[PDB]
Amino acid sequence: SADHEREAQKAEEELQKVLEEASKKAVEAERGAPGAALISYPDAIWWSVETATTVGYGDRYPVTEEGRKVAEQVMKAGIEVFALVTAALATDFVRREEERRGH
Amino acid sequence: SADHEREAQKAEEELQKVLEEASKKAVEAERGAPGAALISYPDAIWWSVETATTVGYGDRYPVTEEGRKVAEQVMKAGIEVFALVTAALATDFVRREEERRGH
Amino acid sequence: SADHEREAQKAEEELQKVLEEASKKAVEAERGAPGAALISYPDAIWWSVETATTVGYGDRYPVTEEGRKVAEQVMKAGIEVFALVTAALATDFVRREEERRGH
Amino acid sequence: SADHEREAQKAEEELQKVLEEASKKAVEAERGAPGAALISYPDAIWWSVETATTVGYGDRYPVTEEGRKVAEQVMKAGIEVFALVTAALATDFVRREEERRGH
């Protein structure tokens, strides 16, 4: 991997760490909410997966008394990580010059 | 500290302003709309937060009488904000050149 | 104004064109297909809005007969338009170079 | 014919291949899971198509035994290919230099 590519890879790993925290706060961010739906720790992790990828299909979601920000904060983490990889995108075309002479 | 970083932070503040304004109109927009499902100022901001992210997740959703344009404005506002910050991400790759010099 | 702003602005108008065509085909694509729930002409236009800017909260759900491609194509068109302006977004930081010299 | 378009266009081709392979897994993955909703085979690709566009819309949703990773894999696959196109797009502002000269 390239220097810039390594940075993007590092950012991806950071997102995974957040999911672990999301899976937890998710259990508590429901146990005691009006109309709750996200219960159980084994299933709470799965919900965490479908959200950090900026894809809120639905399935399960936090209420209000459970700091709705629980999901918002987790999702935002993904935006920054997937947004940083840009440093590796703006260089995607730049290589065209190297490809010209095969540098 | 830099000059593009501050501009990016300012854009984030603008998004929050819209959400606050969205909550006001959002509630009023619903008042009179069928199947609104969205009412009350205290929960108006809650639905507004997911709207800016365009994620929506699956909490609520406006109707047609509430001038759907109400969401379109908020959803579009969020997308533009998370895009302008590119001014600080488009320079991420450029830093590689500065590192080469070591100054 | 920058030649990128005017170019990006033009792209926005192109997105609206698809919605107009989508508002129609959507009625027919849904009017006559099984499991359809779109129908209605004044309601079809409203659906053809938030869908373009992704979101997925079109407030509806097309089946298969309605040539899902009806919505798929609409959503994709938004990505191209929203992704095209990316050019104007890049030149964002580039302006910093001029700030250094104050030119 | 702009090498950037060839690379970007090529990425889209790989996206279609994933949907075909993923579609067969989605239906199979959904089978055997509790509360399965995606039991369709011919329409399995249809759901996969919207999945690659990272939207979900609101047609169907994977369970937990369907190795949610199945749906998650398609979403990431779409982001990579589309995100890569950022190359030709990021190079959009660069062309300004040629336009500035007039040839």
Side-chain angles (χ1 to χ4, degrees):
Chain A
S1 288
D3 181 353
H4 41 106
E5 291 176 1
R6 289 277 186 180
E7 190 70 8
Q9 290 177 314
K10 185 177 181 180
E12 291 176 3
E13 294 292 350
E14 187 70 8
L15 183 60
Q16 290 179 179
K17 185 175 82 59
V18 178
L19 290 173
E20 296 295 340
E21 295 295 340
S23 63
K24 182 178 181 179
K25 277 66 175 179
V27 321
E28 292 181 1
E30 217 80 4
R31 294 274 299 278
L38 194 149
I39 58 174
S40 212
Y41 171 91
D43 83 335
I45 171 58
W46 240 235
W47 156 94
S48 308
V49 175
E50 44 173 352
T51 163
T53 84
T54 89
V55 174
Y57 215 118
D59 288 352
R60 297 165 285 167
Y61 41 76
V63 204
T64 299
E65 197 71 7
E66 282 54 40
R68 171 177 172 287
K69 287 181 281 187
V70 169
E72 195 70 7
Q73 182 171 344
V74 177
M75 286 186 293
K76 199 175 180 179
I79 307 305
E80 292 177 3
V81 172
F82 284 116
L84 177 141
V85 314
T86 308
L89 299 180
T91 122
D92 287 352
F93 72 89
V94 178
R95 193 179 293 178
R96 74 191 191 293
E97 187 70 8
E98 292 176 1
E99 182 177 346
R100 183 182 179 198
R101 293 179 180 196
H103 179 71
Chain B
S1 70
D3 62 352
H4 46 273
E5 292 177 2
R6 184 180 187 197
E7 183 178 12
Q9 182 174 342
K10 198 173 68 163
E12 292 177 0
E13 190 70 8
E14 184 177 13
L15 181 57
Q16 292 178 47
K17 185 175 82 58
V18 174
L19 291 172
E20 292 176 2
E21 293 178 274
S23 59
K24 183 182 181 180
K25 301 292 197 179
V27 173
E28 182 177 345
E30 291 293 339
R31 294 275 301 278
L38 169 55
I39 55 173
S40 213
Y41 203 109
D43 72 354
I45 170 169
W46 249 220
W47 149 102
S48 203
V49 168
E50 42 172 39
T51 299
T53 61
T54 84
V55 173
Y57 222 119
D59 290 348
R60 286 176 290 189
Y61 64 102
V63 204
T64 308
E65 184 175 344
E66 42 52 69
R68 184 183 296 287
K69 292 179 180 179
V70 169
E72 189 178 12
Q73 181 173 0
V74 181
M75 298 188 290
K76 186 178 181 180
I79 293 169
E80 295 293 338
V81 170
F82 283 115
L84 178 140
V85 292
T86 297
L89 311 179
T91 150
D92 286 353
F93 82 81
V94 181
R95 289 179 178 176
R96 77 190 180 86
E97 188 71 7
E98 295 294 339
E99 293 294 306
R100 185 184 68 182
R101 301 279 176 85
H103 300 286
Chain C
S1 289
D3 290 346
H4 327 62
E5 291 292 338
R6 65 185 185 194
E7 184 178 12
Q9 183 177 340
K10 185 174 70 163
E12 292 177 2
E13 184 177 12
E14 183 177 12
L15 183 58
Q16 293 177 4
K17 198 203 311 200
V18 174
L19 294 177
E20 294 293 339
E21 292 177 1
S23 303
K24 183 178 181 292
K25 306 289 184 178
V27 321
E28 198 291 327
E30 285 282 302
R31 181 70 162 177
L38 190 141
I39 58 171
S40 277
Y41 276 76
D43 306 337
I45 170 56
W46 238 233
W47 161 89
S48 75
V49 177
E50 65 190 325
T51 188
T53 158
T54 74
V55 201
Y57 274 37
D59 203 43
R60 299 183 182 287
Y61 65 109
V63 63
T64 307
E65 183 177 344
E66 81 324 314
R68 181 175 293 289
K69 305 286 183 179
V70 169
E72 206 295 328
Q73 181 173 344
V74 176
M75 298 188 285
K76 185 179 181 179
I79 308 307
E80 295 294 339
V81 173
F82 278 116
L84 183 97
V85 312
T86 295
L89 279 289
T91 130
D92 291 353
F93 77 96
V94 179
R95 183 174 293 178
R96 81 192 184 176
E97 293 176 3
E98 291 177 359
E99 184 178 12
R100 289 175 61 211
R101 310 294 190 176
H103 190 274
Chain D
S1 74
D3 192 13
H4 329 73
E5 292 176 0
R6 289 176 64 87
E7 185 177 13
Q9 182 172 343
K10 185 178 181 179
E12 297 295 341
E13 186 178 12
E14 185 177 11
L15 183 59
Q16 293 177 324
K17 185 174 72 165
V18 175
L19 291 171
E20 292 176 0
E21 295 292 350
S23 59
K24 184 260 178 180
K25 288 184 290 198
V27 71
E28 185 178 12
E30 201 76 4
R31 192 88 183 271
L38 204 168
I39 56 174
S40 83
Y41 155 43
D43 292 345
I45 168 168
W46 246 223
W47 157 96
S48 202
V49 167
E50 51 179 39
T51 298
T53 50
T54 64
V55 272
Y57 217 83
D59 290 345
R60 304 180 185 275
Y61 60 97
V63 204
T64 317
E65 185 175 345
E66 82 98 59
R68 175 173 294 279
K69 294 180 178 77
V70 172
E72 205 295 327
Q73 181 173 344
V74 178
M75 296 177 192
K76 201 176 177 63
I79 292 170
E80 292 176 1
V81 290
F82 278 117
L84 182 142
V85 183
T86 295
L89 299 175
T91 326
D92 290 353
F93 79 82
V94 178
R95 290 179 180 274
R96 77 188 180 86
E97 183 177 346
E98 289 80 355
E99 183 178 12
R100 179 259 300 160
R101 184 175 295 277
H103 56 266

